[PDB]
Design a protein around this ligand. Structure first.
Ligand SMILES: CCC(=O)N(c1ccccc1)C1CCN(CCc2ccccc2)CC1
Lengths: 211, 213
């Protein structure tokens, strides 16, 4: 099975340099050109360039000529993109991608945030109903940078879930998630929001208890 | 550089219909055009290559046509699951370039919001904050008016609203509304109300609680 592994999160200061990585497995690394794509907050796609891992040869969008450098490490089956003198204009999700046979394969993307604000862990609060179907909530308040991952019962509880886009309030993000189940299910069965904020090394589970 | 133009940012359709998204290249690109689907918060997924060939596993409801400068992605038998963004791309010459993307939008039957209100959690109160959260879920159409009252008086300061995209399961919308207070402000009042008007009813949907219960 072809897979491309990218780190999910990178927060850096303006003016710094970063080396983004894309680790490949499940195919012959040197036989296929690697592509890199940029996607900015609420924007479209931009092609950055591609690289031939067999010999290092590259084609790069001239827009990124003094910004990005593509390299590969054969022996670890890893493609790299070096970005220099970072600005907020470089905050984006960066994807690596290949085509093997007649299938396309994508990394899950690195969310790169360029900011002088500091990593902040969120507070995670369970929301039970006030004192036929019941809705529970999970409030994830005050974190930086994006993203957080929120699941319910470690993902096994997926239907009836609404996880809302985060909003920014004084350099911190907040989001919430709702989940609706049948009144015979809760609280007789246990329901827990699982919240991960990799940037702050944060993983917490809040079981929803009746007030 | 070659400019790919998807003139429609948005395109309305109904389920079961056929819809066509167009892309115009600024100079000739042969048939070296690809189409991609992107779910919010996910990596792109290639649909079509060489203008008309489906990648393997892509449903045959998706078809592509065109050559030269005018390219069309057609979706037959549109369904809720197609509520994504669609991108064209030319890979005829470097640098490869994308169109600006087209969002699909589905007309379905009206549906009233399910409204739930949540007092601050006990854990949050210990830390000195007080957030009151209101969910308004699975409604249609998108237009909805949310109003907060405290002790019977309208409150606008400190409210933040967030909307989901149109839902890929049932084409509805959902919304969260969060009133953020200090603990002192929260403990200084008793009644908290989230209220919503929507074209499905002649009267607001009202959810309320009293702090001292
Ligand atoms: C944005 C990156 C990009 O432009 N692409 C891409 C897409 C997904 C994953 C990797 C790269 C192109 C897709 C079309 N191919 C040519 C057509 C084709 C199809 C099937 C097998 C072989 C060739 C060139 C690259």
């Amino acid at each position: 099975q072809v897979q491309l592994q990218q780190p999910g999160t990178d927060l850096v200061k303006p003016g710094a340099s970063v080396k983004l990585s894309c680790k490949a497995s499940g195919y012959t690394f040197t036989s296929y050109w690697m592509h890199w794509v940029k996607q900015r907050p609420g924007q479209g796609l931009e092609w950055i360039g591609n690289i031939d891992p067999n010999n290092g040869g590259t084609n790069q969008n001239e827009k990124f000529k003094n910004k990005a450098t593509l390299t590969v490490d054969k022996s670890s089956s890893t493609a790299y993109m070096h970005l220099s003198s970072l600005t907020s204009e470089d905050s984006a999700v960066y994807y690596c991608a290949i085509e093997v046979g007649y299938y396309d394969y994508w990394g899950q993307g690195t969310t790169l945030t360029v900011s002088s604000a500091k990593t902040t862990a969120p507070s995670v609060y369970p929301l039970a109903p006030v004192c036929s179907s019941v809705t529970l909530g999970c409030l994830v308040k005050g974190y930086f940078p994006e993203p957080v991952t929120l699941t319910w019962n470690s993902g096994s509880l997926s239907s009836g879930v609404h996880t809302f886009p985060a909003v920014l309030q004084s350099d911190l993000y907040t989001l919430s998630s709702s989940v609706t189940v049948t009144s015979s299910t809760w609280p007789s069965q246990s329901i827990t929001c699982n919240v991960a904020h990799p940037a702050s090394s944060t993983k917490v589970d809040k079981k929803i208890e009746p007030r | 550089d070659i400019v790919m133009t998807q003139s429609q940012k948005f395109m309305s359709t109904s389920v079961g219909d056929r819809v066509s998204v167009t892309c115009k290249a600024s100079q000739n690109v042969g048939t070296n055009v690809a189409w991609y689907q992107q779910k919010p918060g996910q990596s792109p997924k290639a649909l079509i290559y060489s203008a008309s060939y489906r990648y393997s596993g892509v449903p045959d409801r998706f078809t592509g046509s065109g050559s030269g400068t005018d390219f069309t992605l057609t979706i037959s038998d549109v369904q809720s699951e197609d509520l994504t963004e669609y991108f064209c791309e030319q890979y005829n010459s470097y640098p490869y370039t994308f169109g600006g993307g087209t969002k699909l939008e589905i007309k379905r039957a009206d549906a009233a919001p399910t409204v739930s209100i949540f007092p601050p959690s006990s854990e949050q109160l210990t830390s000195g904050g007080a957030s009151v959260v209101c969910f308004l879920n699975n409604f249609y159409p998108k237009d909805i008016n949310v109003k907060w009252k405290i002790d019977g008086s309208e409150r606008q300061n400190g409210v933040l609203n967030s909307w989901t995209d149109q839902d890929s399961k049932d084409s509805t919308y959902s919304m969260s509304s969060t009133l953020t207070l200090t603990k002192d402000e929260y403990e200084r009042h008793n009644s908290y109300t989230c209220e919503a008007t929507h074209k499905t009813s002649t009267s607001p949907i009202v959810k309320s609680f009293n702090r001292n219960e």
